[PDB]
Amino acid sequence: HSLTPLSMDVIRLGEKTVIMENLRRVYKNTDTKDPLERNVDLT
Amino acid sequence: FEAIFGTFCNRLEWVYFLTSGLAAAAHAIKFHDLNKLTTGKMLFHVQVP
């Protein structure tokens, strides 16, 4: 029931505002691949 | 007669290391006893998340 003020970047579009987050800071120098870097197959 | 109007010397201006921005990449340290030693090492200990 308590909130903590933290700062991020916000995009404004279509009368809705969206938080922008680059998760590269989490997966640095570790074994597990960042799931947002996906592979795609086309035939 | 033949006239010698003037004689001139080189007005060469000195240059110095720290006065050049190239020292910005550097970090200059003076070390009198450097002539005695032959090796220099630094050790890094890093663990991963």
CSV table of C-alpha atoms in Angstrom, one decimal:
chain,number,residue,atom,x,y,z
A,1,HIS,CA,0.0,0.0,0.0
A,2,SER,CA,3.2,2.1,-0.2
A,3,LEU,CA,4.9,3.3,-3.4
A,4,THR,CA,8.5,4.2,-4.2
A,5,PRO,CA,9.3,6.8,-6.8
A,6,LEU,CA,11.7,5.5,-9.5
A,7,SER,CA,12.6,7.1,-12.9
A,8,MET,CA,12.2,5.5,-16.4
A,9,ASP,CA,11.6,6.7,-19.9
A,10,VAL,CA,8.0,6.9,-21.1
A,11,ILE,CA,6.6,7.1,-24.7
A,12,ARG,CA,3.4,8.9,-25.4
A,13,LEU,CA,1.2,7.6,-28.3
A,14,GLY,CA,-2.5,7.2,-29.0
A,15,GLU,CA,-3.5,8.8,-25.6
A,16,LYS,CA,-1.8,6.0,-23.8
A,17,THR,CA,1.7,6.1,-22.2
A,18,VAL,CA,4.1,3.2,-22.2
A,19,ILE,CA,7.2,2.4,-20.2
A,20,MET,CA,10.4,1.8,-22.2
A,21,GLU,CA,12.8,-0.8,-20.7
A,22,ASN,CA,16.0,-2.2,-22.2
A,23,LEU,CA,16.7,-5.4,-20.4
A,24,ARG,CA,20.3,-5.6,-21.7
A,25,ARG,CA,21.5,-4.5,-18.2
A,26,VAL,CA,20.2,-7.7,-16.7
A,27,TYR,CA,21.8,-10.4,-18.9
A,28,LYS,CA,25.4,-9.0,-19.2
A,29,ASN,CA,28.3,-11.3,-18.6
A,30,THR,CA,26.1,-14.3,-17.9
A,31,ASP,CA,25.6,-17.8,-19.4
A,32,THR,CA,21.9,-17.6,-20.2
A,33,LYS,CA,20.7,-16.0,-23.5
A,34,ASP,CA,18.4,-13.0,-23.3
A,35,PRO,CA,15.1,-14.3,-24.6
A,36,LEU,CA,14.3,-11.1,-26.5
A,37,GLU,CA,17.1,-12.0,-29.0
A,38,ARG,CA,15.1,-14.7,-30.9
A,39,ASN,CA,15.9,-16.8,-34.0
A,40,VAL,CA,13.5,-16.9,-36.9
A,41,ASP,CA,13.1,-19.6,-39.7
A,42,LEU,CA,11.8,-18.9,-43.2
A,43,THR,CA,11.4,-21.6,-45.9
B,1,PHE,CA,81.3,47.7,-50.4
B,2,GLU,CA,79.0,44.8,-49.8
B,3,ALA,CA,76.5,45.3,-47.0
B,4,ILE,CA,75.4,42.7,-44.4
B,5,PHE,CA,72.0,44.1,-43.3
B,6,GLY,CA,71.0,41.4,-40.8
B,7,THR,CA,71.9,38.0,-39.3
B,8,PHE,CA,69.2,35.8,-37.8
B,9,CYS,CA,69.0,32.8,-35.5
B,10,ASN,CA,66.4,30.1,-35.1
B,11,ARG,CA,63.5,31.2,-32.9
B,12,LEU,CA,62.5,27.6,-32.2
B,13,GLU,CA,59.7,27.3,-29.6
B,14,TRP,CA,59.8,24.4,-27.2
B,15,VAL,CA,57.1,21.7,-26.8
B,16,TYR,CA,56.1,19.8,-23.7
B,17,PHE,CA,54.3,16.5,-23.2
B,18,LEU,CA,51.6,17.6,-20.7
B,19,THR,CA,50.9,20.7,-22.9
B,20,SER,CA,49.6,18.3,-25.6
B,21,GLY,CA,46.1,16.9,-25.4
B,22,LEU,CA,47.6,13.5,-26.3
B,23,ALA,CA,48.5,13.3,-22.5
B,24,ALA,CA,44.8,13.1,-21.8
B,25,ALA,CA,44.8,9.5,-23.0
B,26,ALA,CA,47.9,9.1,-20.8
B,27,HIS,CA,48.5,9.2,-17.1
B,28,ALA,CA,52.1,10.3,-16.6
B,29,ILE,CA,54.0,9.1,-13.5
B,30,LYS,CA,57.7,9.8,-12.7
B,31,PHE,CA,59.6,7.0,-11.1
B,32,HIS,CA,63.3,7.5,-10.2
B,33,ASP,CA,63.9,3.8,-9.4
B,34,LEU,CA,62.3,2.5,-12.6
B,35,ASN,CA,65.8,1.7,-14.0
B,36,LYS,CA,66.2,-1.1,-11.5
B,37,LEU,CA,63.0,-3.1,-12.1
B,38,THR,CA,62.1,-5.2,-15.1
B,39,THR,CA,58.4,-6.1,-14.8
B,40,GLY,CA,55.1,-4.5,-14.0
B,41,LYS,CA,51.9,-6.3,-13.3
B,42,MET,CA,48.3,-5.7,-12.2
B,43,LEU,CA,45.8,-8.3,-11.0
B,44,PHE,CA,42.1,-8.4,-11.7
B,45,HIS,CA,39.6,-10.7,-9.8
B,46,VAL,CA,36.2,-10.7,-11.4
B,47,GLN,CA,33.1,-13.0,-10.8
B,48,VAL,CA,30.1,-13.2,-13.1
B,49,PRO,CA,26.4,-12.7,-12.4
